[PDB]
């Protein structure tokens, strides 16, 4: 009945009971899929976006939409607007960097991380590496594991700094 | 039917708390204002 209903400010008015109710896996998936065709539509964005948080409760109380999820930001770390600036597109950009380094903190870690090289390799600026170098290492605790240091480390390369980095080059290069 | 489900390995233990969780906490406020209505 929300979704149809074509919904923002109600959702945060309700979202209690959305909380309540995303515990039901596939209830969860019929909001995954409605917040995806509502944020799908071409500017979406320069008006609300409390959409992405809902993942949130999504990814970190179901694993197995972990790989969703991320598959959905994908498209989203993809967001180009000429009205909404490039300045607003990084910060976009950067909000879903957080989501995604928040879901890499639930263990889906290897495919976040190997498309992170991937898109550094190809598109995604210097600075948005930067960014989520700097809100992992001041969210990721030690001890790190080689599975993720492999793909996160020799991406690191190109930066130094966020020095947390140096730690964090020192320690899992030790 | 579909088989028993495995938790995910946990390789290190959160020093804190994902700030996904402190928006949870964020919007959990006007969840109450909601209920004060």
């Known amino acids: ?174 | 039917l579909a088989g028993p489900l495995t938790p995910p390995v946990k390789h290190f233990q959160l020093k804190r708390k994902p700030k996904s969780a402190t928006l949870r906490a964020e919007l959990l406020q006007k969840s109450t204002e909601t209920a004060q209505q």
Not at chain 1, 71 to 98: I, N, P, R, Y
Request: aromatic share 8%; net charge negative; hydrophobic share 45%.
């Open chain 1, 1 to 174: 009945n929300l979704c149809c209903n074509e919904n923002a400010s109600e959702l945060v008015a309700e979202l209690s009971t959305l909380y309540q109710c995303i515990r039901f896996p596939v209830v969860a998936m019929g909001v995954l899929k409605w917040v995806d065709w509502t944020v799908s539509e071409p500017r979406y964005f320069q008006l609300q976006p409390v959409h992405l948080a809902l993942l949130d409760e999504i990814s970190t109380c179901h694993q197995l939409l972990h790989p969703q999820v991320l598959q959905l930001l994908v498209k989203l770390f993809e967001t180009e607007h000429s009205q909404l600036d490039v300045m607003e597109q990084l910060e976009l950009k950067k909000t879903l960097l957080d989501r995604m380094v928040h879901l890499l903190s639930r263990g889906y870690v290897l495919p976040v991380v190997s498309y992170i090289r991937k898109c550094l390799e190809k598109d995604t600026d210097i600075s948005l590496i930067r960014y989520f170098v700097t809100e992992v290492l001041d969210v990721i605790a030690p001890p790190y594991t080689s599975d993720f240091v492999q793909l996160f480390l020799p991406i690191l390369e190109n930066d130094s700094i966020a020095d947390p980095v140096t730690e964090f080059i020192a320690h899992c290069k030790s």
